Enzyme design. Structure first.
Site, PDB file in Angstrom:
ATOM      1  N   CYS A 140       6.810   7.689   8.140  1.00 50.52           N
ATOM      2  CA  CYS A 140       7.600   8.451   7.134  1.00 50.52           C
ATOM      3  C   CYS A 140       6.702   8.707   5.912  1.00 50.52           C
ATOM      4  O   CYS A 140       6.566   7.792   5.075  1.00 50.52           O
ATOM      5  CB  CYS A 140       8.875   7.697   6.771  1.00 50.52           C
ATOM      6  SG  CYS A 140      10.337   8.761   6.649  1.00 50.52           S
ATOM      7  N   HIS A 155       3.338   2.362   1.987  1.00 49.31           N
ATOM      8  CA  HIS A 155       3.754   2.897   3.303  1.00 49.31           C
ATOM      9  C   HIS A 155       5.070   2.226   3.710  1.00 49.31           C
ATOM     10  O   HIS A 155       5.297   1.061   3.303  1.00 49.31           O
ATOM     11  CB  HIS A 155       2.626   2.670   4.310  1.00 49.31           C
ATOM     12  CG  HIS A 155       1.390   3.433   3.985  1.00 49.31           C
ATOM     13  ND1 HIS A 155       0.964   4.465   4.750  1.00 49.31           N
ATOM     14  CD2 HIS A 155       0.496   3.298   2.986  1.00 49.31           C
ATOM     15  CE1 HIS A 155      -0.137   4.965   4.232  1.00 49.31           C
ATOM     16  NE2 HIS A 155      -0.452   4.257   3.147  1.00 49.31           N
ATOM     17  N   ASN A 171       0.835  -1.249   0.000  1.00 47.87           N
ATOM     18  CA  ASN A 171       0.000   0.000   0.000  1.00 47.87           C
ATOM     19  C   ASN A 171       0.857   1.282   0.000  1.00 47.87           C
ATOM     20  O   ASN A 171       0.273   2.364   0.140  1.00 47.87           O
ATOM     21  CB  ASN A 171      -0.954   0.098   1.197  1.00 47.87           C
ATOM     22  CG  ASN A 171      -1.623  -1.210   1.562  1.00 47.87           C
ATOM     23  OD1 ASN A 171      -1.515  -1.667   2.699  1.00 47.87           O
ATOM     24  ND2 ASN A 171      -2.303  -1.826   0.607  1.00 47.87           N
TER      25      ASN A 171
END
Ligand SMILES: CCN(C)C(=O)c1cccc(N)c1
Ligand SMILES: CCN(C)C(=O)c1cccc(N)c1
Lengths: 263, 265
Positions: free
Chosen positions: B223, B188, B186
């Site tokens: 992040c 991330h 996804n």
């Protein structure tokens, strides 16, 4: 995994894991690159043996000079992939490993790979031709008649790669390895370089295309306090020309090319 | 890969691969970290999930990892099979817990154990919330009902509050950034990547002469595209202990804090 009936090739089955896939829920080419590394290792274990024998006697090792990979279909998360691998003498010039990837449910080919290895010295780093007694240790574990994942006469895996010229179309500067990029002898593993080469492909291209072919020459090692810049330029299906170089003095470590199909 | 007889826990067997081990030819904590993740994922699927419920998908709600705690007695060697059993439990309205046991497949002895705190959060607003009864019911039928704790001890190092690290730091690794191999499906940054970032400021000397026994790591922010991390470590001490902090190298925004505990070989 196991040596085949004749003990002249090795097969292994892999189930694609959750952290091993990208945004298409298919395996990254890095995961693919690591399964080839893995299957190549277990094939060295099986026979007796990086895959040194009468080499560490004179402090000699095999080292990748060139990786070449073509993927038709990236296996999906949960899919079993079967990889078959074998090794062949390219006389005293060479030494080649080929792989074949099949869907384990259809028996159908989804990918094939090939690579060139040469002798060194972990210390002096000087290239060395293969001696007689070195071809009497491994040639009994190799097919005698040529067997090529890339049979085609004048194909994509034997041809010269030019040096990218400044300015570069695209760049990712100041790439550093971490401990997870190191193998068990504390060298950056051949697969991180593939990652660094792909880092300067724009996201727009990754998001809309699929990587069909990668070709990577290994010119010099990165020593975990070296920092890499990664340079790409569209030469064109999209094609790219690639250069990895040390952030400072601009010393070459890899050059490559890639080939993408529209999804 | 199967649920157990009672289908309230899941087991998987992993063979340690060549590229999965460090300088001692035993698996890295990060490789362990990844197998715990892989087995948790296969257990969600096994009971029919993706690990969002029916209601959660409707309400744009996801499960996020607040705390990871991992204690390794022995790192499995290259070529060794390792068995991991995993299970979930209601921590009331606060969230869930996931617990792991690592065993040697040849001897059957425990070689590691992990535990994690999962809180519920809106995908979009990034905003924590408690576990509505509507949701509790949908996953309770997949959890043990009597408590089952990988870390039972009356005072275990898995539930203790972690201080913030005071500048100046003793050690640091400046300017760390993710590549695409650091991203999940996804897009991330993978939760394991922070483990590696935390451990980059541990100096090589310690790594070459000790083993990692315990890591405790809290997750505060992720992040979020183009971010760059700095990693800070200070010795808090046979046994070396460390205090750890990750932060965005710009404004110095906290993303992670942690501790580790190493023993001399
Ligand atoms: C990462 C490993 N690399 C690049 C090498 O050690 C090397 C150096 C010179 C020639 C060749 N073929 C390989
Ligand atoms: C990538 C995982 N992380 C760091 C998060 O999304 C996050 C954000 C806030 C709190 C927590 N616990 C986790």
């Amino acid at each position: 995994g196991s040596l085949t009936e004749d003990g002249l090739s090795y097969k292994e089955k892999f189930v694609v894991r959750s952290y091993e896939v990208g945004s298409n829920k298919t395996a990254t080419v890095e995961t693919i690159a690591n399964l080839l590394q893995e299957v190549g290792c277990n094939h060295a274990q099986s026979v007796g043996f990086a895959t040194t024998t009468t080499m560490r006697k004179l402090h000699l090792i095999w080292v990748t000079a060139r990786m070449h990979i073509e993927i038709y279909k990236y296996p999906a998360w949960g899919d079993v992939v079967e990889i078959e691998t074998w090794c062949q003498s390219e006389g005293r010039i060479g030494t080649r490993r080929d792989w074949i990837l099949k869907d384990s449910v259809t028996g159908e080919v989804t990918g094939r790979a090939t690579s060139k290895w040469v002798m060194m010295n972990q210390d002096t780093r000087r290239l060395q031709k293969v001696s007689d007694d070195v071809r009497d240790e491994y040639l009994v574990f190799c097919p005698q008649e040529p067997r090529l994942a890339f049979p085609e006469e004048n194909n994509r895996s034997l041809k010269k790669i030019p040096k990218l010229e400044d300015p570069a179309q695209y760049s990712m500067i100041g790439l550093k390895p971490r401990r997870a990029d190191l193998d068990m002898n504390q060298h950056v593993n051949n697969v991180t370089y593939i990652g660094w080469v792909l880092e300067s492909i724009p996201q727009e291209i990754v998001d809309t295309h699929e990587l069909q072919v990668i070709t990577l020459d290994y010119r010099r090692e990165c020593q975990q306090d070296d920092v890499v810049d990664s340079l790409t330029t569209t030469t064109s299906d999209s094609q790219f020309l690639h250069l990895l170089r040390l952030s400072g003095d601009g010393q070459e470590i890899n050059r490559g090319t890639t080939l993408w199909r529209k999804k």
